[PDB]
Symmetry: C2
Subunit: 331 residues, 2 copies
Amino acid sequence: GLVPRGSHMTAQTVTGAVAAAQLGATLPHEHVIFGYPGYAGDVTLGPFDHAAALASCTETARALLARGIQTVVDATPNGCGRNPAFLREVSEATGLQILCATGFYYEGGGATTYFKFRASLGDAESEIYEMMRTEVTEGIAGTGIRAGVIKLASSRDAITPYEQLFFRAAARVQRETGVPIITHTQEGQQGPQQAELLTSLGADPARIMIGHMDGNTDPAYHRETLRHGVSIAFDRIGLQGLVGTPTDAERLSVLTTLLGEGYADRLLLSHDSIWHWLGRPPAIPEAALPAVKDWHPLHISDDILPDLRRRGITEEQVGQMTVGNPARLFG
Amino acid sequence: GLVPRGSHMTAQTVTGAVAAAQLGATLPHEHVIFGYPGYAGDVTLGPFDHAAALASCTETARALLARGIQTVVDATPNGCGRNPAFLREVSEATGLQILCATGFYYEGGGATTYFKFRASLGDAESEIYEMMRTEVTEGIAGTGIRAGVIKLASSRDAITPYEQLFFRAAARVQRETGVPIITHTQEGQQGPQQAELLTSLGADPARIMIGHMDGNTDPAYHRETLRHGVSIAFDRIGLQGLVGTPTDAERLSVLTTLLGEGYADRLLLSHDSIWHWLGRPPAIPEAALPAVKDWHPLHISDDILPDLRRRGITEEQVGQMTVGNPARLFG
Ligand SMILES: [Co+2]
Ligand SMILES: [Co+2]
Ligand SMILES: [Co+2]
Ligand SMILES: [Co+2]
Ligand code: NA
Ligand code: NA
Ligand code: NA
Ligand code: NA
Ligand code: NA
Ligand code: NA
């Protein structure tokens, strides 16, 4: 198959390097804690309850370990609450391995004023490249905790000039270190584009995972993204009917077709779940209850995998998506 | 003249209440420390140097006190680096009185994802009202440090539906507590609108200061804002040629005309200066040097006031803008 080619480090979780073989079954895109940019501005009424958060998260972590999931990739952008030290707390308490990211969110949902501004004053791309490179080879906020992946995100209608500063910095870093890249696609679009862009910028397709691909239901769109030899991820499984987002029945339709055409080695599955919100706890409006009912990290282990298997998917296919793939991609 | 009418507390600086008579000459809109939303995401390479920052800021503070300026209103939005405890450090070290704000920035330069999101899920206006009310009557992040003013900001083309959530919350709070409101106008527009809106929402025009009014050079625009009986502020004096922003020569042209028509009691003067940047220190491109040369907090005391006086402005007019007005408005 296609093996990563070029410089390579070692999967750097928030508690240290780990050999690819030790990653085990993995959820490639989740969020232990998250907060939309501005949550910090609601600190007075939406303060972080460390004790409550640490207890809640370790609880969830132990439930994953109970299901054989040994590793989780936390994809929280630098502006969206990323807290390595805490993540490390959760990891050290449970034994769950967690990698964290480096990067900012798409123009519309990230804390974009800062670099959008620096961009007008100078070489922001280079500045972003330096931050990424440092966070992936030395550590974050000087804690010694390195990022295990670079997270990129784009908007619906295009990968904006601001978002591209980040794709270029990432490519530089991916080329230089071999670190993996996971991405966020907005409302099921730009998947092929990020693939064309990253590969054209020289980033290794074998270390690239185009995210939120379940956000699109036309399998032609997936087949086109996969042409670039990158991995794609149905990573919001469980979130049904919010922000474009299709139903799982729909996601599984596509998946069984792609699996049916031999794409097992390029497909990963996650929830993009949030275990503990930062800011004021979200007020889930009555009509939205069903949309998020299966939007938790135990959904794939308990509902999805059994559903694929009983449909014809093999134990080997499930094993390739949940263990094989994360192994080669982050390992 | 027009005196504040309705409930009223006491000017709440970051070190306690202070009688209006004790405010002295004041700079109604400055920023001891600031950071565009996202600066926190650049923590690894743009970390906060407390010692260096505390030394730099107290230095600046002492320079203001040396010029008779006894009070500064820090207008930093909740997402833009607001740090009451630190502000209090600077105040306690020098004796400079500082009030801090409560509020978020305009849709385009603030950390707007959070509430723009909560807005779609529920009654964000009410949530924002609660935060504001608490921060102005009880304190911020539970530190006991209360906000002395509510800061509102709008965009260039309109006061957006998101920005209006904030104008409505503020109005509620202004009506209920009597706390002052200072605002940010984008690229010299919406001044009359914020005035129409706030007053129509029942906020006291005698506790309202429409900001960044020097951003517009047509005095017809000022005269129309002033019709609502609110105060207007040429509060970016010193920033010349960046983000619309006119030249001081131009700002003074308008000012001497407004002063010439008897508007002394409704005009305030500030710099919207930043004493210490949060994040990676800003890279000032060669061509921009002149634009920010006079963009520091000693500019009005040393250059502006002497310029007005030598033009015909009286010691009493200068005294009304720099001492009288802040006294009634924040006192
Ligand atoms: Co995403
Ligand atoms: Co996510
Ligand atoms: Co402003
Ligand atoms: Co300002
Ligand atoms: Na558990
Ligand atoms: Na971000
Ligand atoms: Na793969
Ligand atoms: Na000094
Ligand atoms: Na803000
Ligand atoms: Na006034």
